[PDB]
Amino acid sequence: GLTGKLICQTGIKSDGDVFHELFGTRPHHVPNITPANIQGCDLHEGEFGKVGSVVIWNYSIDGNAMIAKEEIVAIDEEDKSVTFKVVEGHLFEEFKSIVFSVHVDTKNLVTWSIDYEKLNESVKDPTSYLDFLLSVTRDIEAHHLP
Numbered sequence: 001g002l003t004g005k006l007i008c009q010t011g012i013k014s015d016g017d018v019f020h021e022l023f024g025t026r027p028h029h030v031p032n033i034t035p036a037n038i039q040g041c042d043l044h045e046g047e048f049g050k051v052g053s054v055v056i057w058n059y060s061i062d063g064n065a066m067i068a069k070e071e072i073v074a075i076d077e078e079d080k081s082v083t084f085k086v087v088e089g090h091l092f093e094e095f096k097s098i099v100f101s102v103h104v105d106t107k108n109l110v111t112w113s114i115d116y117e118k119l120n121e122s123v124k125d126p127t128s129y130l131d132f133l134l135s136v137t138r139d140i141e142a143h144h145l146p
């Protein structure tokens, strides 16, 4: 009853390898490119670009500052995908678990997926994070377009 999945897909005209590796090896540069959305990315454990690294994101939605600590649980170079599992922060006021994945198909299409389990049934499905992820994707595309 508590489980759901949200997905957004959109095209980018910028390079899809550069987009993938932004999130896979350079996530700490994301705040510099989309500062209205994401104000910080600090390495908590491990190393950038390695499975099992843990980062702390400082981000904002509708003018409200929030924090998410995430474990990078998968980086698939072949599929051009990165998966971030939330382990602490604001989102744990609503969810038991929530996982973000970003995939790039370069035959370019960026797909964001949100997999989640709500603490209880009155919790809203986190659709607002799709608007957030589309905004971050559009700022990255604009930055990467020469």
Ligand SMILES: CC[C@@H](C)C[C@@H](CC)C(C)C
Binding pocket: 030, 038, 057, 058, 059, 068, 070, 084, 100, 133, 136
């Ligand atoms: C939890 C909200 C933001 C900081 C999400 C991040 C995806 C896991 C970010 C890299 C877009």
